[PDB]
Amino acid sequence: MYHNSSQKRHWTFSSEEQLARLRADANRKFRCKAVANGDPVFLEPHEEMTLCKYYEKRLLEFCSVFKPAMPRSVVGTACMYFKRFYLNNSVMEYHPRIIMLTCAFLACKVDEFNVSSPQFVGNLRESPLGQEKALEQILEYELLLIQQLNFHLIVHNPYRPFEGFLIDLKTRYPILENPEILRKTADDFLNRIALTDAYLLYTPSQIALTAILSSASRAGITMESYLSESLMLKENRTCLSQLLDIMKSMRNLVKKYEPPRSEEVAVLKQKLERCHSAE
Amino acid sequence: ALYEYQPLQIETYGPHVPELEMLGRLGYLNHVRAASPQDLAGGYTSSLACHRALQDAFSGLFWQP
Amino acid sequence: KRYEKLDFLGEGQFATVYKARIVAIKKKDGINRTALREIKLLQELSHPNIIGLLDAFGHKSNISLVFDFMETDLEVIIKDNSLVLTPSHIKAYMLMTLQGLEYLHQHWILHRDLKPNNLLLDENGVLKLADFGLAKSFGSPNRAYTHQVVTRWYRAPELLFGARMYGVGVDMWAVGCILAELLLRVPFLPGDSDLDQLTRIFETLGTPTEEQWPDMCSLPDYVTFKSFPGIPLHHIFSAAGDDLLDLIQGLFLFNPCARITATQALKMKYFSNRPGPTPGCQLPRP
Numbered sequence: 039m040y041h042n043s044s045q046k047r048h049w050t051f052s053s054e055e056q057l058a059r060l061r062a063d064a065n066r067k068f069r070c071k072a073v074a075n076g077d078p079v080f081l082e083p084h085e086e087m088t089l090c091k092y093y094e095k096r097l098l099e100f101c102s103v104f105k106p107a108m109p110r111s112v113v114g115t116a117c118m119y120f121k122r123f124y125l126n127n128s129v130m131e132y133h134p135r136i137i138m139l140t141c142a143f144l145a146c147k148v149d150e151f152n153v154s155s156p157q158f159v160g161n162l163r164e165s166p167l168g169q170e171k172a173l174e175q176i177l178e179y180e181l182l183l184i185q186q187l188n189f190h191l192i193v194h195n196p197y198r199p200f201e202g203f204l205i206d207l208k209t210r211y212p213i214l215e216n217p218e219i220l221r222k223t224a225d226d227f228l229n230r231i232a233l234t235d236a237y238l239l240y241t242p243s244q245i246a247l248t249a250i251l252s253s254a255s256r257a258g259i260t261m262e263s264y265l266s267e268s269l270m271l272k273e274n275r276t277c278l279s280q281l282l283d284i285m286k287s288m289r290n291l292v293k294k295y296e297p298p299r300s301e302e303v304a305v306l307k308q309k310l311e312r313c314h315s316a317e
Numbered sequence: 318a319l320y321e322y323q324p325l326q327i328e329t330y331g332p333h334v335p336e337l338e339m340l341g342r343l344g345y346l347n348h349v350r351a352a353s354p355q356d357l358a359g360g361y362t363s364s365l366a367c368h369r370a371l372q373d374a375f376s377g378l379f380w381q382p
Numbered sequence: 383k384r385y386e387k388l389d390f391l392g393e394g395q396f397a398t399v400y401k402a403r404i405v406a407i408k409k410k411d412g413i414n415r416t417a418l419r420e421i422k423l424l425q426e427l428s429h430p431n432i433i434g435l436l437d438a439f440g441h442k443s444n445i446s447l448v449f450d451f452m453e454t455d456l457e458v459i460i461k462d463n464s465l466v467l468t469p470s471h472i473k474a475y476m477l478m479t480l481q482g483l484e485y486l487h488q489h490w491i492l493h494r495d496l497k498p499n500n501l502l503l504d505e506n507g508v509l510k511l512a513d514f515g516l517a518k519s520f521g522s523p524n525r526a527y528t529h530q531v532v533t534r535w536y537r538a539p540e541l542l543f544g545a546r547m548y549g550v551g552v553d554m555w556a557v558g559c560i561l562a563e564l565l566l567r568v569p570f571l572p573g574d575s576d577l578d579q580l581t582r583i584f585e586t587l588g589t590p591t592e593e594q595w596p597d598m599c600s601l602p603d604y605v606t607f608k609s610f611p612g613i614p615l616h617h618i619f620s621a622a623g624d625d626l627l628d629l630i631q632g633l634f635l636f637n638p639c640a641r642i643t644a645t646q647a648l649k650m651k652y653f654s655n656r657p658g659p660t661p662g663c664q665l666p667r668p
């Protein structure tokens with residue numbers, strides 16, 4: 039359960055400043071290791087972030103067209119693994135193209151999505167020789183990925199909390215006529231929330247509730263009474279204010295999100311391939 | 318030293334979840350798909366899915382890192 | 383690493399266990415899925431009656447798992463003809479087993495491999511459920527399982543009839559079988575096959591009917607059996623008191639929905655009655 043999970047205990051951070059600190063520290067430690075081992079070949083932490091965002095979209099695209107149909111829980115677990123890995127590691131040391139596939143592989147194992155390795159790599163749009171090479175790379179990096187996750191494999195995603203909130207609204211909030219009208223748009227917001235650092239900063243339940251309430255606000259529906267009365271936050275107004283602040287912060291994270299630009303990402307990809315070819 | 322049952326006390330950091338044996342009385346089960354006769358024969362009831370979903374929805378809702 | 387190999391505890395079907403400095407290390411498809419299952423589940427669980435995963439490490443496609451070292455298991459206790467299993471000892475074992483199970487089921491995990499040798503005992507008499515290589519989370523409709531789980535002697539009839547969807551009843555039936563083995567000192571229902579397992583179950587407990595199991599016939603591998611009257615429990619378990627017989631009946635109810643949960647079993651009068659459970663320090667050592 040989330041309330042005593044490893045995700046809450048070790049992988050939900052207090053602020054974006056902490057995440058930036060971890061990423062900059064990873065970039066700097068790779069820089070120091072490379073300098074000791076052996077120039078402007080290094081990528082900056084914001085360039086690492088841009089590449090990580092791009093490769094997270096690529097991981098999402100890989101999981102979407104993956105046959106057999108990969109469940110949404112496996113995809114969420116894989117994306118969480120990717121984010122957590124690149125919190126403490128540099129894309130210059132481990133290529134995100136292979137790490138993302140390794141994340142999908144490990145998530146398929148952890149979430150009991152039974153797929154054989156050959157049928158896992160058959161989803162790649164590459165040649166059979168490239169498929170075998172990719173499989174060997176994935177097998178090489180599986181243990182590394184598990185180590186960098188500190189052997190914390192269960193990932194709590196907002197999808198089941200989202201379903202539970204829909205059930206609770208249908209049962210206890212007649213003011214909302216048909217809560218299912220809120221699904222699609224909330225799902226949309228969910229996707230957007232997933233692109234940010236929110237999954238490292240907020241609980242799955244908070245993410246789900248934020249998505250639902252943003253969907254309601256877009257629909258114009260006010261569900262302040264659901265928080266106040268059904269969730270009984272009128273007894274602790276401080277709890278209600280903290281929850282509202284959390285959702286406002288998440289909405290701000292979504293609104294400020296800067297999708298990676300094609301040309302900037304292409305330049306960064308040339309830079310990263312140069313960094314991997316050298317050393 | 319006689320044993321006395323005490324319930325497990327795990328803080329969920331969220332709203333109270335209604336008891337498993339009350340969901341049907343409260344109308345929650347009207348919004349989950351009914352367990353098939355084979356599912357019921359094996360011991361799976363839709364009340365299990367509803368309870369898990371509500372527990373996940375309310376778990377850690379009030380928690381702050 | 384930081385653990386020095388002391389002793390070769392034994393070998394399992396999936397790995398080999400070594401006692402180290404005191405802990406036990408369980409040393410193209412990549413990392414073994416059973417080891418990953420144990421990792422992912424035991425990292426999220428913390429209870430005195432669940433085996434503790436203290437650390438984990440590996441190399442290449444191999445991985446090691448570090449656990450607390452356990453002195454013995456319930457199977458060694460049961461088969462030790464030199465050990466007397468008083469009602470208090472049985473109650474203590476059942477209590478710890480059920481507390482671990484209640485915590486596990488509250489976190490929506492089924493053990494699915496419950497049997498005396500998977501109930502380890504440390505030197506302090508604390509019982510712990512171990513071997514989570516078959517454990518799986520439950521409660522999702524869209525998450526089907528396999529019926530070929532649990533050791534055959536301890537497999538519930540719903541599993542034997544092919545239940546792909548099931549709940550805590552599998553663990554509770556295995557718990558009833560463990561209780562019966564504790565009382566009889568021999569396996570309660572020692573089948574040699576699935577059909578013979580169901581035959582032993584129905585010959586001992588009676589052939590289930592529609593009123594005891596309304597949807598029984600809907601299970602995929604359902605086979606009609608001869609209508610055995612069964613053996614009354616007080617005949618099978620002569621020394622069992624009325625409260626213990628009520629517990630046993632609850633654990634062996636054919637309908638898995640009616641079958642008592644770990645919580646319900648813990649609230650039963652058997653556990654709050656005299657004599658109290660044996661303290662761990664006083665439990666028999668084999």
Ligand SMILES: CCc1cnn2c(NCc3ccc[n+](O)c3)cc(N3CCCC[C@H]3CCO)nc12
Nearest residue numbers: 391392393399406408449450451452453454455
């Ligand atoms: C993996 C967790 C663990 C902790 N202690 N321990 C031990 N302790 C010694 C022991 C236990 C029970 C009975 N006897 O006689 C000795 C043994 C062992 N494994 C190897 C030997 C046969 C059992 C098998 C069980 C697999 O979990 N595994 C473990």
